[PDB]
Write a protein that binds this DNA or RNA. Structure first.
Ligand code: MG
Ligand code: MG
Ligand code: MG
Ligand code: MG
Ligand code: MG
Ligand code: MG
Ligand code: MG
Ligand code: MG
Ligand code: MG
Ligand code: MG
Ligand code: MG
Ligand code: MG
Ligand code: MG
Ligand code: MG
Ligand code: MG
Ligand code: MG
Ligand code: MG
Ligand code: MG
Ligand code: MG
Ligand code: MG
Ligand code: MG
Ligand code: MG
Ligand code: MG
Ligand code: MG
Ligand code: MG
Ligand code: MG
Ligand code: MG
Ligand code: MG
Ligand code: MG
Ligand code: MG
Ligand code: MG
Ligand code: MG
Ligand code: MG
Ligand code: MG
Ligand code: MG
Ligand code: MG
Ligand code: MG
Ligand code: MG
Ligand code: MG
Ligand code: MG
Ligand code: MG
Ligand code: MG
Ligand code: MG
Ligand code: MG
Ligand code: MG
Ligand code: MG
Ligand code: MG
Ligand code: MG
Ligand code: MG
Ligand code: MG
Ligand code: MG
Ligand code: MG
Ligand code: MG
Ligand code: MG
Ligand code: MG
Ligand code: MG
Ligand code: MG
Ligand code: MG
Ligand code: MG
Ligand code: MG
Ligand code: MG
Ligand code: MG
Ligand code: MG
Ligand code: MG
Ligand code: MG
Ligand code: MG
Ligand code: MG
Ligand code: MG
Ligand code: MG
Ligand code: MG
Ligand code: MG
Ligand code: MG
Ligand code: MG
Ligand code: MG
Ligand code: MG
Ligand code: ZN
Lengths: 62, 71, 96, 48
RNA sequence: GCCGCAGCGAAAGCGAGUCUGAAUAGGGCGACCCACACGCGCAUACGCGCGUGUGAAUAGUGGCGUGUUCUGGACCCGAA
RNA sequence: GGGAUGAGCUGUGGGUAGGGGUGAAAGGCCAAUCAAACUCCGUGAUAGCUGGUUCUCCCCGAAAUGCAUUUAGGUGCAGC
RNA sequence: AUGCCGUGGUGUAAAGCGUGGCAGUGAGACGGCGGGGGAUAAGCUCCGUACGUCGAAAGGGAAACAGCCCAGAUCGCCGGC
RNA sequence: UACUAAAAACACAGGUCCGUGCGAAGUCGCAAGACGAUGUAUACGGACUGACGCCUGCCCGGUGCUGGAAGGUUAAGAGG
RNA sequence: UUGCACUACGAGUAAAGAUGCUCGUUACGCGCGGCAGGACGAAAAGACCCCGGGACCUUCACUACAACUUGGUAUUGAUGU
RNA sequence: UCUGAUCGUAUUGGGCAUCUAACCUCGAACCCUGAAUCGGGUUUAGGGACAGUGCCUGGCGGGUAGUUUAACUGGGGCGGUUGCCUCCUAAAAUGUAACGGAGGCGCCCAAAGGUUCCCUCAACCUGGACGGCAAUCAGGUGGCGAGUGUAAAUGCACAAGGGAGCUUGACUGCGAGACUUACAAGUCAAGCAGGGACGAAAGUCGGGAUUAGUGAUCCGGCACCCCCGAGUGGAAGGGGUG
C-alpha cells in the first residue's frame, strides 16, 4: 500500500532548492491595528523550520 | 493571592572586557539603571546596545554608572 | 503533540495558488551544448535527447550559463536572452 | 468609545492607515497629512 | 513511466539568477572551487575575473541485507 | 405457622418475544444468568489500563527536570 | 564570603561542539546546608544547592539496619600494607 | 422482591376530575385490520384518592389545560 | 489448598505488626485425641474510597427523529355573488 | 392630472353560496355464491370538490435515539482559581514551588504623540481684607523628602517633572547584529533610501520614562493590484497587498 502524505503539512511547508524546509510565520492574519510596522515586518516572509521540529516535519511531508 | 508575572530575564548580558559586535545587546533593564556612554545607544526600552565593535567598559560620569565601547 | 495545537495546525497555510495550465520546459545550458558538441554544426532537440542532456517528448529551452566557443545553429523553443547573445557572438543562429 | 478608524488619501482614495480615536472627543472626521505610497508623497488623509 | 539532469516566484514569467522593492539599495532563496603557476591591472607580499594545466573532484540510480516508521489484527493475552 | 367455597387450587391444549412481552408494581419474571434474554455473525470490537514476552558474552550507560497539554499514573519538544 | 561572565597562562586521553540513526526517562527517596507552609511538630509538605548516597552499588563498619561512615567487585592465590 | 425484605408496601369497594357522540376516545400495526364491544355517556378509557363518619380552608402570580383573535412577530408559495 | 521446610519463644530491627534478620532464652525423635491465639489462614483480580470505561434513568443540557399539527400545490370540477 | 372616489369590456385571485361528475361512506339492496358479517361488481341513499394521500413548508415534540457534562486539589466533594503586568519568598548573575505573602490589567491620550526653546518642586518660617492649619501675594530656607494618566518596581532635579510655539514620524521600502527561547511566539536595534515635521544649524523623530491594556490556525468580509481565468473572448470563482 502506497504511503500517504499529510494534507495540512503539505499546505503549510515546502522545500527549497537544496532541501531545507521553509514555513510562514503566525500572528499576521488579523488584529493588525495595534501591531507596529516593525512587528509586522518581522513577521513577514518565509523562514526555515527549527532543528527541533525538522524530524517530525520531514516525517509528515514524506 | 497566587498571581504572578513572567520573569523578564533582565540584567547585564556582556561584562567588562568582553569583545562584542555592532548591535549586541549589553544590558536589559527598566529605566536607566546604567547610562549609555560612547558608542552605546539606549533603545526604546532602555536596552543599552553596542553601536560599534569593541570592548565593554563600565565607568562613572558624575553619579551615573555608564557603559561604553572602546574600539 | 500531547493535546496542544500541533505544528501543522498552528502555522498558516502557504500563500498563493497553483497554475493549472503552467507550461514547463526542459532546460540546457550553452556550456553543456559546447561540451557535447565541440565540433559545432546544426543542433536540434532530437540531438539533445540522443546525447542525453534533456528529457524526451518535452519542450526544450536553452539557457545562457557557461561559455561557448563552437559555432552552432541550434533550434529549440523559447531561448533566453543571454543564450541568444552567446550563440550570435560565437557565430551560430538561434531559431525557434 | 474608541473605534478603529481608517484613513484614505484625499487624492487617490486609497486606504493606507488604520488607527483609533475617541468618538466623543473628536465627533467629526479626523484629518491628517500622511505619506501616500501610491501618490509617492505626503497627502491629506481623512476618515472613511 | 519514475528518479537525477537549475533555480526563483502566489502566479503570469524570467533564468545562474530570481522575488520584494522607485533603487544598479538592502535583504530571502539558489548557483559559484583554488594547496598553484603563467599574460593582463594588481601588491612588498597575499589574490582579484578571464585561457590551459600544477589535473582542484563532484553523482545519481537500481538491487540485496539491517534499524526505525506508515496502512493493515501488526509483539501476545484480557472486559463490561 | 397462613389460606383452606374462593380475587381458590390444579391437569390438558393454546396465545403474547427483547427497547419487546407480562407485571394486585418488587425493576419483579421471560428455561438455575435480566436497569434490556439467548445464539451466531461484524470480530482477532476497544481498553492513556493490568499481566506476559524464551540462548550467550564484550564496550558504554541514564532519568524521575523545563515548557505545553480535556493535562496531571498519558503524550509532544527540550534536557540527560 | 561564595557563586556568575570574559580573558592570558599551566594541566588533563576516553572533555566539549555540529550534523544524522536508535532510545529510555518525564511517580523519585533519604541525608547535609539555605528557605517557605505547619505549632517553627511529623518517617509531614513545597523550593534551592558543578551537595552526597540509593535508585542502578557488591565489599568492610554502625548488633540487626536501601539512602549514615570507609570504599567503587575483570578473574585466580591457603601472599603483604 | 422464584434464591437474605410479607410489611405500614400493592390491590380493593367507595370518591372526584379529565377525555370519548361511535369501524368513539385509547392501544397494537407502515397500512389493511384488530381489541375497545357484538358495548353506546347509568358506557368505555386515563389520573389521583382509597370502607365508614365529620369535613375538605385561602391563592390563577409561575407552569400546564380549555377557550378567544384586536394588535405585534413569523415558513413555503405569489410578486419581481 | 500447596514457592520451600529437620516451620520455638522474648526483647529488638526491617516496606514501620518477623517461623526464616540480631542478641539471648528454651526445647530428646515420632505419633494419637482435642482447642482455636497466629500463620496479615482459605474462599471471591474489595461490594466501601479514587481514576478511567460502560450501562440504564431524569430533565426548561445539545442535536436529531417518530407522532400530532399549519399553509401551498397536485389529485380537482361547474355556476353565481 | 402622484388621479385618493369611480365606471365597461379583458385577466386574475381571495371569501361566501349553490351544484354534481372526480373522490369518500363499517348506510341499504342484488350477483359472483354451491356453504361467505371477507372481497369485488351493479343499483340506490348520502357526503362532496371538503376530507384523505404525494411533494414542499412552518410549529410542537424526553415519546424515542445518540452523546456531552474540564482541570487543579495535603483522598474526593464544597469553596476558590485558570490569561497578562509589578514586588517579596528567591539564598548579592539568570531561573526557581506551594490552595505562599501583597497589589494591578482586558485601558487612556488627536494630545498626555514629534520637535524647538524656557523653568524648577514639595514642605517649613515671616508678613499680608475676607482668608482661617490649609485659596491667591511677597521675601527667605529648601537637591529632591513633590510630580510622573493609571498597580508596583527600576528610573528621572542633567530632568523622563512644569510652560509655550510650530506640527503628524501614532510614516513607506528595508534592516547588519543581538536578547529570550522546546517549538510556536515575544523583544531591541545602528544604519540605507523615499517623502516629510521641527530646528539657524548640529541634529531628533518608525507613538507615549520603561515593563500590562490581549487571542494562534481555520473559515469568512471589505478596499486596492490586474496575477490565474477549464475550447476561445468575457464573466463567475480564485490569487497577492492592507
Ligand atoms: Mg490577509
Ligand atoms: Mg500595519
Ligand atoms: Mg516578577
Ligand atoms: Mg513604546
Ligand atoms: Mg481636543
Ligand atoms: Mg516553484
Ligand atoms: Mg511588501
Ligand atoms: Mg539578491
Ligand atoms: Mg552506488
Ligand atoms: Mg381466616
Ligand atoms: Mg382454616
Ligand atoms: Mg405454548
Ligand atoms: Mg434487548
Ligand atoms: Mg426502587
Ligand atoms: Mg431465572
Ligand atoms: Mg442496551
Ligand atoms: Mg469492522
Ligand atoms: Mg562504566
Ligand atoms: Mg485544550
Ligand atoms: Mg545566587
Ligand atoms: Mg544523538
Ligand atoms: Mg507527567
Ligand atoms: Mg513529576
Ligand atoms: Mg531544612
Ligand atoms: Mg520545611
Ligand atoms: Mg517525605
Ligand atoms: Mg536536599
Ligand atoms: Mg525504577
Ligand atoms: Mg552497599
Ligand atoms: Mg553513582
Ligand atoms: Mg555495607
Ligand atoms: Mg598491619
Ligand atoms: Mg426473597
Ligand atoms: Mg421471608
Ligand atoms: Mg403476611
Ligand atoms: Mg408491593
Ligand atoms: Mg381511533
Ligand atoms: Mg364525565
Ligand atoms: Mg387530575
Ligand atoms: Mg395511597
Ligand atoms: Mg377506585
Ligand atoms: Mg396559579
Ligand atoms: Mg394559570
Ligand atoms: Mg389568568
Ligand atoms: Mg392557548
Ligand atoms: Mg499490619
Ligand atoms: Mg511491633
Ligand atoms: Mg517480635
Ligand atoms: Mg527471633
Ligand atoms: Mg537461617
Ligand atoms: Mg494434633
Ligand atoms: Mg487458629
Ligand atoms: Mg484472607
Ligand atoms: Mg459506589
Ligand atoms: Mg396536502
Ligand atoms: Mg383536498
Ligand atoms: Mg423530546
Ligand atoms: Mg435520553
Ligand atoms: Mg458511539
Ligand atoms: Mg479534578
Ligand atoms: Mg480538599
Ligand atoms: Mg530574586
Ligand atoms: Mg536573582
Ligand atoms: Mg484581579
Ligand atoms: Mg511627554
Ligand atoms: Mg508640542
Ligand atoms: Mg516635561
Ligand atoms: Mg498606530
Ligand atoms: Mg533583521
Ligand atoms: Mg528623506
Ligand atoms: Mg532611527
Ligand atoms: Mg504608561
Ligand atoms: Mg479546525
Ligand atoms: Mg474560458
Ligand atoms: Mg474577481
Ligand atoms: Zn494617494
Amino acid at each position: 500500500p502506497k504511503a500517504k502524505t499529510h494534507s495540512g503539512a503539505s499546505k503549510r511547508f515546502r522545500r527549497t532548492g537544496t532541501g531545507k524546509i521553509v514555513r510562514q510565520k503566525a500572528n499576521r492574519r488579523h488584529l493588525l491595528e495595534h501591531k507596529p510596522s516593525t512587528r509586522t515586518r518581522r513577521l513577514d516572509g518565509r523562514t526555515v523550520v527549527a532543528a527541533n521540529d525538522t524530524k517530525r516535519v520531514t516525517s509528515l511531508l514524506n | 493571592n497566587g498571581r504572578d508575572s513572567a520573569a523578564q530575564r533582565l540584567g547585564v548580558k556582556r561584562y567588562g572586557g568582553q569583545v562584542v559586535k555592532a548591535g549586541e545587546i549589553l544590558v536589559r533593564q527598566r529605566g536607566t539603571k546604567f547610562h549609555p556612554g560612547v558608542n552605546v545607544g539606549r533603545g526604546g526600552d532602555d536596552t543599552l546596545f553596542a553601536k560599534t565593535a569593541g570592548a565593554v567598559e563600565f565607568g562613572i560620569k558624575r553619579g551615573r554608572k555608564t557603559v561604553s565601547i572602546v574600539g | 503533540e500531547g493535546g496542544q495545537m500541533p505544528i501543522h495546525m498552528r502555522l498558516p497555510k502557504l500563500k498563493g495558488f497553483r497554475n493549472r495550465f503552467r507550461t514547463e520546459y526542459e532546460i540546457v545550458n550553452v556550456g553543456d551544448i559546447n561540451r557535447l558538441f565541440p565540433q559545432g554544426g546544426a543542433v536540434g532537440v532530437d540531438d539533445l535527447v540522443a546525447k542525453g542532456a534533456v528529457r524526451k517528448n518535452a519542450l526544450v529551452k536553452v539557457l545562457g550559463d557557461g561559455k561557448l566557443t563552437a559555432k552552432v545553429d541550434v533550434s529549440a523553443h523559447k531561448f533566453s536572452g543571454s543564450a541568444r547573445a552567446k550563440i550570435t557572438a560565437a557565430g551560430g543562429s538561434a531559431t525557434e | 468609545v474608541r473605534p478603529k478608524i481608517t484613513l484614505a488619501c484625499e487624492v487617490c482614495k486609497h486606504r493606507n492607515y488604520i488607527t483609533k480615536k475617541n468618538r466623543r472627543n473628536d465627533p467629526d472626521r479626523l484629518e491628517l497629512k500622511k505619506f501616500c505610497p501610491n501618490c509617492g508623497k505626503h497627502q491629506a488623509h481623512r476618515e472613511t
